[PDB]
Design a protein around this nucleic acid. Structure first.
Ligand SMILES: Nc1ncnc2c1ncn2[C@@H]1O[C@H](COP(=O)(O)OP(=O)(O)O)[C@@H](O)[C@H]1O
Ligand code: BEF
Ligand SMILES: [Mg+2]
Lengths: 98, 93, 107, 88, 504, 95, 80, 107, 93
DNA sequence: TCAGGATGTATATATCTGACACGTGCCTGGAGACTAGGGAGTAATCCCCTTGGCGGTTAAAACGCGGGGGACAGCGCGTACGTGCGTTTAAGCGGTGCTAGAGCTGTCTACGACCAATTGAGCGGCCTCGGCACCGGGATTCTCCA
DNA sequence: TGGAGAATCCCGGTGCCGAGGCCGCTCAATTGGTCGTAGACAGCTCTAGCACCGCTTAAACGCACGTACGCGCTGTCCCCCGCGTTTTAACCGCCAAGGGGATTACTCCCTAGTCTCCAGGCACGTGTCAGATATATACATCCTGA
């Protein structure tokens, strides 16, 4: 029989890995395309610096990590372990971002 | 001593908008505070813009940019339109 | 000659001269342009007029002829852009919007 | 034939893939994730980026430039009350 | 080393005292120490270890190369492409194998479409040479390095441009004899990582090869030249300002003779026209066609920025896409099923004349080749070939290692009904031979006209039994006209001096 | 008698319609003076200063109770609880 | 001296009702008293810093307004 | 006389003259006292030394010898005063403190 | 073009604290940003203090009060101690 | 399901009063006028840097699938919270009494701005080796099913 | 109550590239004068904050009582995790080519500083009417029982 881990073991191992590391977690080209597309709706034909795009990505990832921590707290509060869109919405609503 | 505020100007605007409506003292003080707070926000943002570009003169363009940064969405368009209209009339006459 | 105030020649009600003075005496920059006070006064007048008309409508809906902090609160918190602007502001003697969650109401 | 039009489906916001979002949640400390979290996260990220980019572009356009710079992005963030260290 | 330096100067100083001037124009290590003492004080039979016949200029080139070897000095086989220079190289490696009895470690570099050809010809001619095509993933390269490359069970190894960059560390450990560099066009830049890693290897000799010489500048020239004899030059702007760029200010055009006489025994270039080896030239036509009436509207939409709400950050490339073909701009093809019919040829300017020419050449028996820059444009051409149901093979950038080979063989199979052959420009036409084809057509113009010349002569080599009929497509009243004008400008900025090199 | 949860809703409507303060003046004032006693001794307060403190404190508590209510509903309850308050403050970042 | 108990139970229930809380636990009262004490401590400490810097001995309404503004809770209606 | 820098006189390491110039050109007030730059330089040096000491301990705690943004992040987020100070600050390439919730772990 | 920063000073402080530890380049950029940020916070707070008290000079008393308003707890206490020490040494010497 | 009792809430009308709208008088701050000079604008030049495509590799995303474990719904029960009532308690308002300290004016001096001459500390450019990040094998530890 | 497989750590060797030290120069920091005004300090006024007492009454409090809700337990099923396999697009090198951002020099007009003067805005009365307050009737709505 193939050797399978119990569900959650790999989750915890990944959690330790990614809280140990510090590299960026989103692919740079997809992120850059997204940034350029969003900018297209404000001023046509802009021209970003590489450092500018990197700063945007740093800030975005930090923001999302903090939001997921808050979402985890809300999900635990509801006596769950699975984070859900209502959990995200509650976190943002309490933060005052809705 | 003589202490100044925006009470008379707020009252003139009120009589322009609702011609037969008064306003109580506490509300008047609240709106005085509001005008001071908004003034200070805009002026501070304009100051920071001017220093950012190594200039040393706050002009109507820095005021316009600060308005666009602070005021939200549909308010910004009307605000900049009113400011542009006022400056244009002031320079023309 | 006979003076004609900057506010008048700009078509405003707020004092352009007073705003010019406050800008200069506020340590915001070394120099202050000539259209900066006109612009700023026009914007302040616009915002004041906006809140005033909303508060006047609220007071009329309440069948009063005078504006009070409750009416200012109602106007600000019912207009979403003004509410976003004044998001971290407490209005003395303001109150809160009438609001009850759906789940609490009886079925 | 008829193969020159088989791939037209980028939709850049989809570029933030499911595994990337899951990695972000793992760093946040999340043990288990619902399946609807991905679309919601894409929406949240889009709103955040729109606000920041609007402010940065306003700064740039005020400066009579055509190149958004790291400083402009930093000042947009700081204006939103999210100070960022490491980019001057 | 220093003994080798003295041996080199024995033949370098045997040329003009210009090498002395270069040593004395340095603004200086102990090379002067061996300079001062000297200052004050074959096989023309086409040797039979090959399996075939050597051409006369081929034998002459081999003799020049062995003269360089005996002098322990370097050079550049700048002979025009398709002159059996592969045969020259194979006979030269056979010379080193047999006359000196030294088959050792050798290194050859070729473009990906061309790693096949070198191994095929070396097997065809001297099957006594152990040669590899070092291809495969990390693991397929892993056992290749571990077993045979580490086991020293080879003579020559054939790799691609990037694989050497990937395997520098397991290759630095092997000191070489030759670093054979085909199509030496990557070297034109000094900061190119290929150059950066090829200043690291240590072979006894360094035989640079090309299809065409320098592309733009004396800058380019010394960029190639430095990696021939580096300890001799080891200088950057001395070489430039010493020659003053074809007398860029006085326009004397006589100081060029100094450079030209320096390089004449220091290089070896021959023309196909002088030694025919095929006895048949090539024709050339520029099919100036009008820019299509339908896409006139979108071309206006691009000029006046009229479709809308899209980026234009490289107006060059945008207009060039428009001049190539309308449908690339993501929406010119309105059909939700994306109809495939005569409307495509109707809407594209070039394709109408192209269809006429295809109908002509199918009856005339012309076996055609097509080059392009846009892989997406080649996608559209593949769909249109499906429309006309022609046999072909599509080689593009990033197809495969084996699939490139099998498509080439299928096209060049005798009596192959593959009428057309879709190909890119910068990945396809860098050394392969397609004499089974006769006519070559360019869909677009390229900002490297020397690369264009590299392209057309794919079928115009030894083995061409028909007349080469070149049909370049240029769009009338388009920016491609200025493309062609600048192309001609850069042709003449170099070809005059290239032609002076041979005469004097 | 009214069933439980009726007078509570009536009070909700009443106190959301009203505007005055909800804490007794003198108890709040004694609390304020006692707290300030720990920073400098023998202060002295303006009546408007104390009134401002009361206005700010009541506004703060009301907003906090709205957030606590949201958390309580989120856990499928109708009874706010200390852990609901703690969650609300932790999300806001006051911890 | 047990002044925090001066914030009685009914006062907290009134605040909760204005916030919209229909049903309240029993442990809420001590929790809310602690929260209120912490908030007051922060604001009063800043206000007293302003007062002491001005070399006054009376805490003015403007000091409280400034302290609230510094902590991020702007307050309209008590002068400027 | 003989030049002796104000930083040396105060016994500091930060540039009192540079800080004084920056306070001058920053348009913070009309005038700048003579002890203000000294005080400000002393405060900035104190805070810098505090964080550098903590980050150096963090770096030595991983058997490293050079301080990197991860080490700065660890020091700041582990000291509670500095965490409270830099509560709104994102440190680029800093990462996160290791923390898994109590109920997530296997029982 | 000259561009000034706090690299040399942060490095001298580092060599006083940890005599042998180095510091990378991104970490130094972060420290530079940190110093600039704290400078701006303190200076702005002192500015508004001076304006509130209708003064026109920023003195060590304003800087001390701004430190006490910004820094938390033990940081405030030791920072006040250090600033006072430096000013006393500066005047006496 | 509805009826009728019971309770709280809105609607109507008559009466005070104190907060606001308005008029007077005055004085100080804004407008008019004029000058100097420095900041901002404009032109020309240059050179680094951003963009778009491809080529080729290869790591990561996408996809399918079994299965298990956690979300979720229902049920019971027991106690903690809401509603009401009588008793007590302290808030609120008024009044009298007193003085600390807030706010203002006047003098004058010492401290900070500004300028000019001088010099040395810090910045950009340049070279070099040691800390660090793999890379491979081997050893240990963890997890999971018996 | 177990060995077996996968994960992880230990240790040594290797290549590299960026941190750290040296060096010329230039521009900002220091030193020394003069000069003008901010504010330090004294002295005076009178506001408003603190303290206490008396009386009314509205809220707080303590207790009884009942039920609605929180919480524990059980079962079910659906949807997420884990892993193997195929496909796709990210990533870095490379090639051109312009363009945009920085620098430099010169010019002019727009803002600060100064002075004169008068009217707009502020402090101070004054009446009066919008709102607060008190009663009375109408109606909605909740709740137990049918
Ligand atoms: N001496 C010769 N004898 C026979 N065939 C030749 C000779 N020289 C060249 N060819 C043919 O001409 C073609 C040229 O190929 P190659 O030598 O690779 O040219 P290049 O090296 O210039 O690309 C080869 O396919 C070969 O078959
Ligand atoms: F003649 Be070689 F094939 F370029
Ligand atoms: Mg050949």
């Amino acid at each position: 029989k193939p050797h399978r881990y119990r569900p959650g073991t790999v989750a915890l191992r990944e959690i330790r890995r990614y809280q140990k590391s510090t590299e960026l977690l989103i692919r740079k080209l997809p992120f850059q395309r997204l940034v350029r597309e969003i900018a297209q709706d404000f001023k046509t034909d802009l021209r970003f610096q590489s450092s500018a795009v990197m700063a945007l990505q740093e800030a975005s990832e930090a923001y999302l990590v903090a939001l997921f921590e808050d979402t985890n707290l809300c999900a635990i509060h509801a006596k769950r372990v699975t984070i859900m869109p209502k959990d995200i919405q509650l976190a943002r609503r309490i933060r005052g971002e809705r | 001593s003589r202490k100044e505020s925006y009470a008379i100007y707020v009252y003139k605007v009120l009589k322009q908008v609702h011609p037969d409506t008064g306003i109580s003292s506490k509300a008047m003080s609240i709106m005085n505070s509001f005008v001071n707070d908004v003034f200070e926000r805009i002026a501070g943002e304009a100051s920071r813009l001017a220093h950012y570009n190594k200039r040393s003169t706050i002009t109507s363009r820095e005021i316009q940019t600060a308005v666009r940064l602070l005021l939200p969405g549909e308010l910004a368009k009307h605000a900049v339109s009113e400011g542009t209209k006022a400056v244009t009339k002031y320079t023309s006459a | 000659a006979k003076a004609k105030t900057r506010s008048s020649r700009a078509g405003l009600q707020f004092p352009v001269g007073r705003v010019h003075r406050l800008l200069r005496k506020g340590n915001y920059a070394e120099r202050v342009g000539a259209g900066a006070p006109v612009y700023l006064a026009a914007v302040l007048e616009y915002l004041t007029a906006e809140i005033l008309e909303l508060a006047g409508n609220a007071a009329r809906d309440n069948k009063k002829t005078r504006i009070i902090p409750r009416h200012l609160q109602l106007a600000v918190r019912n207009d979403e852009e003004l509410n976003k602007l004044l998001g971290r502001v407490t209005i003395a003697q303001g109150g809160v919007l009438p609001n009850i969650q759906s789940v609490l109401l009886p079925k | 034939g008829a193969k020159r039009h088989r791939k037209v489906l980028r939709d850049n916001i989809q570029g933030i893939t499911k595994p990337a979002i899951r990695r972000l949640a793992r760093r946040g400390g999340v043990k288990r994730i619902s399946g609807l979290i991905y679309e919601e996260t894409r929406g949240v990220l889009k709103v955040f980026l729109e606000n920041v980019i609007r402010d940065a572009v306003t700064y740039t356009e005020h400066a009579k430039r055509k190149t958004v710079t790291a400083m402009d992005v930093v000042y947009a963030l700081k204006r939103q009350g999210r100070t960022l260290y490491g980019f001057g | 080393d220093l003994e080798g330096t003295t041996k080199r100067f024995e033949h370098l100083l045997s040329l003009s005292g210009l090498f002395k001037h270069f040593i004395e124009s340095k603004a200086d290590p102990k090379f002067r120490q061996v300079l001062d003492v000297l200052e004050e004080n074959q096989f023309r039979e086409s040797p039979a270890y090959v399996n075939g016949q050597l051409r006369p200029y081929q034998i002459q080139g081999v003799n020049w190369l062995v003269s360089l070897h005996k002098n322990k000095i370097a050079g550049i086989l700048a002979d025009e492409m398709g002159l059996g220079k592969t045969l020259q190289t194979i006979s030269f490696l056979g010379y080193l194998r047999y006359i000196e009895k030294i088959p050792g470690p050798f290194l050859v570099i070729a473009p990906k479409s061309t790693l096949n050809n070198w191994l095929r010809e070396i097997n065809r001619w001297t099957p006594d040479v152990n040669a590899f095509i070092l291809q495969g993933d990390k693991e397929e390269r892993a056992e290749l390095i571990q077993k045979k490359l580490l086991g020293c069970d080879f003579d020559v190894v054939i790799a691609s441009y990037e694989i050497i960059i990937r395997e520098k560390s397991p290759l630095k450990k092997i000191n070489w004899e030759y670093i054979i560099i085909d199509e030496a066009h990557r070297i034109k830049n000094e900061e190119s990582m290929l150059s950066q890693v090829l200043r690291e290897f240590t072979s006894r000799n360094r035989l640079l090869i090309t299809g065409t010489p320098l592309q733009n500048n004396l800058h380019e020239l010394w960029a190639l030249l430095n990696f021939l004899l580096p300890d001799i030059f080891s200088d950057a702007q001395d070489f430039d300002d010493w020659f003053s760029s074809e007398s860029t200010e006085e326009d004397q055009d006589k100081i060029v003779k100094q450079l030209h006489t320096v390089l004449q025994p220091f290089l070896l270039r021959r023309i196909k026209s002088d030694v025919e080896t095929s006895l048949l030239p090539k024709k050339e036509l520029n099919l100036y066609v009008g820019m299509s009436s339908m896409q006139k509207k979108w071309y206006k939409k691009i000029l006046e920025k009229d479709e809308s709400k899209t980026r234009l950050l490289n107006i060059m490339m945008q207009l060039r896409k428009c001049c190539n073909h309308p449908y690339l701009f993501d929406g010119a093809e309105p059909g939700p099923p994306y109809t495939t019919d005569e409307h495509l040829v109707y809407n594209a300017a070039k394709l109408q004349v192209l269809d006429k020419l295809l109908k002509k050449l199918k009856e005339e028996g012309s076996r055609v080749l097509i080059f392009s820059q846009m892989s997406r444009l080649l996608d559209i051409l593949e769909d249109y070939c499906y429309f006309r149901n022609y046999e072909y093979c599509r080689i593009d950038g990033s197809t495969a290692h084996e699939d490139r080979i099998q498509a080439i063989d299928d096209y060049n199979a005798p009596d192959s009904k593959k009428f057309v052959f879709l190909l890119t420009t910068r990945a396809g036409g860098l050394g392969i031979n397609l004499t089974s084809a006769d006519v070559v057509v360019l869909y677009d113009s390229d900002w490297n006209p020397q690369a264009d010349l590299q392209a057309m002569d794919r079928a115009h080599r030894i083995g061409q039994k028909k007349q080469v009929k070149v049909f370049r497509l240029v769009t009338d009243n388009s920016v491609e006209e200025k493309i062609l004008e600048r192309a001609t400008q850069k042709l003449r900025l170099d070809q005059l001096v290239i032609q002076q090199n041979r005469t004097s």
